[PDB]
């Protein structure tokens, strides 16, 4: 719970969490997350297949 008087204000204080609990795929609508890892190729369930109708 460390806190510094250099900014009595909480304004400049730049609080930034980091996490890797579970794993999700990145995107453009996603910043450069610290974790550039976990290339766990999880299946996509359905498959475009040629049926007959």
């Amino acid at each position, epitope marked *: 719970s460390d*806190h*510094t*008087t*250099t900014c*009595t204000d909480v304004k400049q204080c730049r609080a930034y969490l980091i996490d890797n609990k579970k794993w999700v795929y990145n995107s453009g609508r996603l910043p450069r997350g610290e974790g550039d890892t976990f290339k766990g190729k999880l299946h996509v369930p359905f498959v475009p297949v040629k049926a007959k109708c």
Partner: antibody
Amino acid sequence: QVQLVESGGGVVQPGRSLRLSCAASGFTFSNYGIHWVRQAPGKGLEWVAVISYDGRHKYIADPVKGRFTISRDNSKNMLYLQMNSLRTEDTAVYYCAKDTSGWYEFFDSWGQGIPVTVSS
Amino acid sequence: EIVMTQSPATLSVSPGERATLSCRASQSVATNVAWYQQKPGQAPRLLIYGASTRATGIPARFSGSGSGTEFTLTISSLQSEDFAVYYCQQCNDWLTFGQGTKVEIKR
């Protein structure tokens, strides 16, 4: 190097404007804060401010605030701590913290006030 | 502010590395409290012997040296000598008020 030593315990009866003249030595009083702490010989650095002389905003500290107007002169290096209208609370060695950007940490061989008068 | 209920003294008989522990009742007597491990005599060395209870400030002969060793801001009485004998109260000049350490009298 923080020798912002307050003026000696000055007998200026309560209600008078004492001056805990913490004439700072070379301690970057312009480039770092010089707080005033009107404190007893062993009370602890009861700062009148986390006085950011370097910073824009001096984070005022209640412990010595109140009739101990910190006349801190950043350029002049003198936390003069002029106890304007000093009530009966100047009689305590007004250590002057080097409140570098409002980090009131130092002190000095500070004198005091003495909001009392004694017959000669 | 952070009331610094200082540990009373730095125990030393022979010149040795003592620690003028100066506890804070509310929190750790720290740099935010600006304990500054001060070894304040009345007139003599009445200044921050520590520097925000982290490094040896003005009034230290390395005996009021800045050190928050616990919630006690130990004015580190390293090689505490007879001249090191001072009320090394890690005098907090905290951000809200003083709340300074009462006394950690090195001797």
